[model samples]
Target: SATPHLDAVEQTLRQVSPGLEGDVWERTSGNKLDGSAADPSDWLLQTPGCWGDDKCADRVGTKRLLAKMTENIGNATRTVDISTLAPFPNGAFQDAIVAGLKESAAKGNKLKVRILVGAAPMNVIPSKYRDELTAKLGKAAENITLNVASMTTSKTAFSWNHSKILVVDGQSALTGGINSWKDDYLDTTHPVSDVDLALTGPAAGSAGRYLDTLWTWTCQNKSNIASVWFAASGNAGCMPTMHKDTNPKASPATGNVPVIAVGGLGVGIKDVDPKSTFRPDLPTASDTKCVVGLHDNTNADRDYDTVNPEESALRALVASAKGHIEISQQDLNATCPPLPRYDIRLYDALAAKMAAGVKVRIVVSDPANRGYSQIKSLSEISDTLRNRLANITGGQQAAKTAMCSNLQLATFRSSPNGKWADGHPYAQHHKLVSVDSSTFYIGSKNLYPSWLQDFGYIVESPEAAKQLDAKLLDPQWKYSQETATVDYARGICNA
Candidate 1:
C-alpha cells in the first residue's frame, strides 16, 4: 500500500493531469543542442534586491536586465519581443529602449519590436510616456506593436498578466519576477528585491517560441487586447504573423543545464483546458531532471483540477531534500490556520521533511514590505510552524535543544531609513527555493493563492543552486532576523 503521502501524490496527479505517469524527471548531458556545447557564461542571475547601495550595485538586478535588453536592441538585426506586467516611470532605461528601436528602424534593419503589457485600468495610464514614444518614433513606431492581456477574458477576475520576459533575435532571453517599472531599478533609494535570469542557449530559442505563441494568442483573442495602450497604434492590421526561425543553426546547449520555458493562462494558445497539463513537448531526460510548473486560472469550471506546477514542484523539492530546504520569498503564508487545502499539502510535506531531519530555513520580507493582512498571515504561519516543530519534538525544551534545530524562519529588511522611495518600507520580492543545494526553483509565483497567473523554471543544476544559495542563504540571513512573535507582528499590522 502506498503511504498516505504517496497516496496524496497519486491523487494529486490524477487531479492534475489524468494518465500522466511517473515523476517528471529529465536528464541532459550538459546543455547539448545540435552537437555543440553551449557557453555557460551566457546563463546569468540578475539578483536586484540587495540591502543597500554597495550590494545592490554589485548584483545586477532589473536595471541591468533592462540595460542588456536595450544594448541587444541596438545591436539587433532582426526582432525583439518583450512581455511585462506594465511599463512605466519613463527614465533612462525606457529612453534607451525607445532610442534603440528608433535607431534600428532608421538603419533599414527591417526590425520588429513587439511589446506586450498587462491590461491597465484608465487611472494608471501614463499618456506622456506612450504619446512621447509614439510621437518621437513617428513612422518607426509603426514597426513597434504594443499589445495587452485583457482581464475580461481571464478565468478569474483577479487574474492579470504577470509574466516578465524579453526575447531578442530568438537567440537570447530574460525572464523572472522583475517588472520594467522605474522603481524596480536597483538604485540607492527604493530598489525592489527581485531576481531574473538571462539565457542564451537552446533555452533562449525555446523562450522565443513561447513568446511567439503568446503574441499569437493575444492577437487572436479580441478580449485580450489592450485598447488603452494601443489607442495610438490603433488595432487595425496591428497583429503580425508569427515569427519564423530563419536561421537553421542548431542552438548551443548549456553545459548539462536544461532550461524549460513555462507559461500561464494568457499564453496557453491551444484550445485545451489550461489546467490539464503543462506544455505537451516539455523534454524529459534521464541524467538530469527538471520540471516546469505554472499556475493557471483560465478554466473556472476546472478549478478542482487546478494544476499548480509551482506549488507541486515546491512540495516535491522540499520533500526530496536530504540536507536542507532554503526558501526566500516575498511572503510565506501557507501555514496560517484555515489554510487552503493545497497549502495544507505543501505545509505537510515541509513539516514531514523537517521531522525527517531536513533543515528548513525561510526568509521573507519584513512587515514594512508587505501589507497588514499579509503581515498577519505570515506571522501566524511562522508561529504555527514554530509550534508544530515544538510539538514534533515533544515541546519547547527539545525545540530549544540542538535536536530540534531543523527549522528556522526569518524576515529581511534592507533600507537604512526603513522606507522606500514611495514612502513604503523596503520589501523582499524574491521567489526562490533551493533544495539540497542541487535543485532550485525561481519564478514570479508568490506563496499566496490569489495570484491568478504566474510562471517560473525548475532546474536540476548544482551550478545554479550554488549561485542562488550564495545570495539567498548567506547574505539574506546576515541581514535578516528570526520571524517576529505573532503579537509583535500583530501590533505592527494594527498600527
Candidate 2:
C-alpha cells in the first residue's frame, strides 16, 4: 500500500494546505501516505453512465451523483457536506439539487447538512433557491447551513468557488468538473460531458477539510458584503475539525490505489474578476484589499505567479508518463499569451513526451457547445498542439505517422453533427488526465488559463485508470465525430 508513485504529490499537497485534518489517515494507515486511496471496495467511476462519453447506459454523472448522495443523506447518521460552483440545475436538467437540499433537511433534524456554493461564475446559492431550501427545512433547518464563498476584491481578476465535492459522514467524496448548474446537464440532445471520481479513503477526509477551508475563507472575507451574499448557520464552524471515518478496510474495488487531493487558489492571475457585474456587494476600492486573501497580479504577469496546486500536481503526473496520456478538458487554448503560468508548462511537457514517442490523446469541447461563456475556439487548440508537436517530427511519412498516431486530438459535441456551424449543442467539461492507465487527475480546473479557486485529485491506481479508459477515454475516441490529424501546415480533426 506504499504509494511510492504519489509520495511527492502528497507532500506537495501538504505544503499547499498545512492545517488540514486528513492527516488522520496519514498517521494511522497501513499504506504510508493518506492510507489506501479507497476501501478498494468502492467503484472508481460511478457505474451505469457518465463515466465516459461512451456509456453502457444514458444516465448523466450529475443525476447519478444526485441520486447517490441524496440517498446517502437519508441514511446519514451525522453530517453531510456538499460544495459546488452552483446549486441551480435547470428544470430540463432536473431541480434535483434543490430538491435534495430540502430533502436533506427533511430527512432528519439530527442530520447536520452543509451546502457551500460559489458567489460568482454566477452568484449566490441564488437568493431564490437558498431561501426556498431554507424555508422548507423548518426547525431542522438550523442544522442546515447554506453559505457562499467568493474572491470579490479584484478589479482585474474574477473567481468564485469552483470546486465540486460532496461528503456523507466523512466517507467517499466526489470531485471533478461536473457542474451542478443546468446547461451542463440538460437532457437536450447535447448535455455537458464530464468524468468524476468517487473517492472513499483518506482523500475523503482531506476533501472535507478543504471544504472547511472554504467556509473559513468565506467567513474571513465577509466585509462590506452588505448585499449579504454570505450566509451560514450559527454552528457552521469556520475551519472546523472535520469529522472523518478514516478507518477503511481494503477490498477488491481498489487494491491499494493511492490517491492525493490538491487544490489551487487563483490570485490575481485567474480569479481576480475584472468585470464589476458579479458579487456587487463585495469589497470596494476603500477596502484596501481588492481581491481574496492573496495578492493581485494585474498585468497577467507569470513572473509574480503564486503556487497553483493543480498546475504543480499536473507537471509531476505528466512528467511521470511513459506509455500514453489521455486528456479530456472543456478547453485547451493556444491564445494564452504563451505564458508559463498557464498551460504552456503542461503543453511543453506533453510535447517532450511526444518527442519520446509517448502517444497522447486529447478530447476537448467543440466551439459550438455554448454555456455561460464560449471557450477559446477549437481551431486554436488544434493549431496550438499540432504546431508544438510539429517541430519534434521529421519527414512527410514520419510527420503523418506522428501526427496521426503519436499525437491525436478530437473535439466533442454533445449532439451528432451539431458542431459550430450546426444547431443546439452541449460541451465536454471534463478536466481529466490519465497517464499510462495508472495515474490520473480529475477536477474542476480546465487545461486553459482559467485562474480560479479549483480542486482536483492525483490518483495512482491502475484500476481507476483502466476503468476510466474503458468507461470514458477509449469509447469517447471511437465515438467522437471529429478527430484530428496534424497536417504539414495546419491541423484537421475531420481528417
Candidate 3:
C-alpha cells in the first residue's frame, strides 16, 4: 500500500511517517520531473553578489520574496500559512506582506492566516508589527472569524524551528534559507547570499503539510495560550477549532515540475509526554508505542537513532550524486564536535563520492560562532579532506593531482568594494546543493545536522539548476578562492 503522492525518496526502500514504526522520513512522491514552460519554478535570490562588478548588488532577492508573499496573500481569500525563524520587520519589506494580508482580510472574506515562529527571548514578531496588523483590520479586527496568530514552536521547550516556508491558499509555496531579519532583507551593501524557490503545483499542497504539522503541534499546548496571538475575529482564543484544510488531499497542479517537499520535526512521536493532552481530531494514542526521540543534543536524525526526514533525504541526495556534487552552505562540516572518527557523516559521504571519481565542489561560510568555537571551518575541512583523500588513494602525489582538477573546496567570499573596503566575514547562508546540474536540493537542512528542526526540497529540474547557476553558484564560485594552494611536495601533502 502506497500513498504515491506522499512518499519518501526511494519509496520502496525508505520509511514513512504518521504511523507507529512507520516511514518516519516524510518526503513526497509521484513528482513528475518534466516541468512545464508555462509556469516554471521561480528561483529567488538574496545575495550581496559581486560578480565582476559592484552592480551585482542589484539582485533584490529579499524584496522579491516579500513581493511574492504580498501578491499571493492579496489573492488568497481563504488562507495563508507562513513559517520563519524570525519575522523582524523592515517597513519596506514586510509592509508588502502585512498590507497584502490586511487587504485580503478587508474584503470581508474569511481569510485565515497562520504564522509560526521558532522562538527565543527576542525571536518573535514585534508587538508594533502585530499592532499594525491589528489596527489595519479595523472593523475586521473584531471579526473573530479571522485567525492571525504567530506561535513559537512546541518542540518540548528545547528545539527551535529553523524552517522558512510560505504556503498560500494551499496552491502556492515559497521556501529557502532567506530569513526575515534586517540583515537578510535590508542589508544590500553587504548582503548574505541565500536561495529560495517559488513553487506552484501539487508541491505547494505538499509544502503546506509542514505548516499543518507545526500548527497542530502548537495547538496541543492550548492550556498555555500565551504562545498564540489573535489579530482579528478569526481566533476565538484557545477554543476547540480545527485547522480546516482548504485543500484536503492536494492542491490542483499548475505545472508538471517533479518536486518533492521534505520536512522534519526535531522530535516526532519520539517526544511522548504522557501527561500532555492532544487534539481529539488527530490520532495520538498510537504514538505511545513509538520510539522516544529526545534530540537532546543527539541531532535526532536516523543517523542518530531517531527519525528525521531532512537527514534521510539529505543523505540520500548526497548518495545519489554520480557525476558531481556542488554544495553551498554555511554549516557543511567534515567532523562533529569532539571530532569523532566515525565514517558515516556527510564528509564521509562526500569522500566516498570523490573516491569513486565523482568531482566535488564546496563553497561554504566559516562564520565565527561566539558560542561553539570548536566547530570545523572550510579551511580545516579542506585540509582534512585532502589528507583523507590521499590516505584512501594510497599516495600523496596522486591525491594532489585529483585535488587540483577533480576536487575543489573554497570559502564563500564577496568582491572587495566600498563598505567592504577590506576582506569581510563570510555570510553565504544558502543551504543549497546541486548534483550534476540536473538534480537540485535547496532547503533549511544543512549538510551537517545538530539538534535543530529544518526542511527543504529535492527538485529534479535542469531548468531550476540553470537558475541556480546563473543566479547563485556560477557567480559565487567565480568570486570564491580555494582556501589553500594544493602542493604535494612542500609536505603539504608531505604525507
Candidate 4:
C-alpha cells in the first residue's frame, strides 16, 4: 500500500540540501571532541551518586563544552553569549563562568557578556544564584546582561523555548543537547545522556548572528522578558544592537569538513514574520555536508516553508536513507491511540521504509522516565513495524527471520537504583537520528506533536556518524535495555 500522506514530504526531500559550508570538523562523545580531552577540573561537577560502581562519567559532553566556554571567555576580546534552557542554582561550573566574566571585565576588555535563559512555564522566575552573582559583581555587572524568551501568544499553545547554544566573539560556538546545571552532569547514577558539537570557523559567525537576532526579538517584545540583570540599579543596560543581517556566509574552509548553522523560532527570532528573512540556503554540496534543522510552531498547517526546516529536514532524511535508520529520542507518541488521526507522519515514513527492507533501530527512555503508557505505545509501534517486515518477507522463512532481526526497539535505563532530585528515575533525554551512517540529526525536538520550538543540526560527516553511533548505538553502554520481541508482538495484537 502506498503512503499517500508522505507524497508531499517525499517531494520536499528532493529540494533539501546542506545549508552551510565548512572545511573543518570535530565530533564529541561527551568526554572528548576530535580526540581532544576535556580539562580534569570540569569533572568536579560529577559528584558521587547511588549507582554504586557504575557512576555515569562525562558521557554526554556538557562538561567539555563548559570547559571550552571557560577557556574562550578567558581569552575573549569582544563578546560572549550563553543561551540555554536554564542554569542550575549553584555549582563550580556556574562559578567558573562568573569568574571568567569578572576576569574579562577586570582587564578592561570592554567585553560584553549576554546570558539568555528560556523562561519555560516551569521556570518563569529568575534563578536566585544568577541574581546573587549579579549583586556581587556590582560594577562588573555592567558588562553582562540577562534576558529571557517569553512564551508567545498564539491560538495554538507554544511549547517551551528549548535551545542549548554558546557563542564567543562570533568566532566559536558549541551546541547540541547540553544543558547548564550540575544535575545534568553530577547525578552520576542517572546522568542525562546527550551530545554536543564544538565549532570554530565561519560557522561560528553564523551562530553568533542568530543569537543576536533572538536577543533582539526577546527585547523588542517587552512582555516576553522573563528576567533582567545588569548594573547595581538592577536595570538591564541599553539593549545591544541586533545584527542587521542574521544570515552569515561561509568563511574559507578551515579543513576538509563543511558545516552550516541552523536556527529555529525561539532561538533565531520571536516569530516567522515577513521581515524575518535569516533562513539559510539549503545545502547543494555532494561531499559530506552539514546543515541545521529547527522545529517550530509558526506554521499551523506544518507546511513546507522557510520557518519549518526541522520538519522538512526530518522528512527528507527519512526518505533519503538506504541502509539503516537509528533514532534516539525522549518521546515518540505524537498522536496517540484512540485518536483516529494517527498523524505522526514520521512514524509512517519509518514503517514504509521498514517494509521496503531498511533496518530501523530506536532507543528511547525506559518506563521509569517515559511512564507505562509511553512504553506501551513504543512497544506497539515496534510490533507493527516487525509484523510489516515479516509480512513483506513471509514467502521465505529465512528472509523473514533475517528481517525480524532488523527492526529492533530498545530503551535505556541508567540504573534501577538511580534516582533524581524528585525521586524519579533519571530520564534519557536525547533527540537524535542517523541514516546510512552518513547523515545524522541532533537537537531538542521530541518526537511528539506538542507546539514547542526546537533547533537541531544535520551533519553528513562519516566521522561524526561513527562517533555518535559508537556512543549511542553501540552495545558497550551497559545501561541499554532491549524490549522483548514477544511482549511487543503481544501488545500489538491486543491493540
Tell me which of candidates 2 and 4 scores higher on lDDT.
Answer: 2
Candidate 4 residue lDDT tens string, 148-264: 233332323433456676666665566666666675555444566555666555556655665665566556554433333222124554344422232234432344444334444
Clashes of each: 12, 13, 16, 11
Per-residue lDDT tens digits of candidate 2, residues 1-495? 345557655554444333332431121121111112333323433322443333224564445555654554554545677767655434532245445555655765455555656544334454555566666555656765544333332333555667777766666567777766654454443455676666555566666666665555555655546211554455453333334332232311322456667766555323321221211122112211224443333223332222355655676677778788888776665222222223555565676687778877777776654452244454455454445555556433444455555666767643234342224444677888888888788877777665556787777767666767775676667556354534222344333
lDDT score at residue 173, model 4, on the 0-100 scale: 63
Model 1 CA lDDT for position 484 = 28
Candidates in order, TM-scores: namely 0.71, 0.73, 0.76, 0.70
Please state every model's RMSD to the true fold in angstroms. 9.0, 8.8, 7.9, 9.1
Q: Candidate 2: TM-score? A: 0.73
Worst 10 residues of 3 by lDDT: 280-289
List per-prediction Cα lDDT, in the order shown.
Answer: 0.52, 0.54, 0.55, 0.49
Worst 10 residues of 2 by lDDT: 24-33
Q: Pick the candidate with the highest lDDT.
A: 3
| lDDT of candidate 3 over 1-495, digit per residue (tens) | 122222334452244333311112334434432223543333444444345554444554554566666777777767777777755445554666667766776776566666656654232244455566666556654542333444544434345567887777777777788777765446545456677777676666666766666666566653354455433343344222223446556556565567656666664324432222221122112111123432222322232223345654666676777688888877555233322222233555576677787877877664453121224554555555656566567766665565655566666665533224324455667888888777777777766544445767777767667767776777676666534233222222221
Compare the candidates by TM-score and give the number of the best one. 3
Off by over 4 Å in 1: 1-63, 87-89, 106-108, 120-131, 138-152, 184-188, 223-255, 266-308, 334-342, 371-373, 384-404, 415-424, 482-495
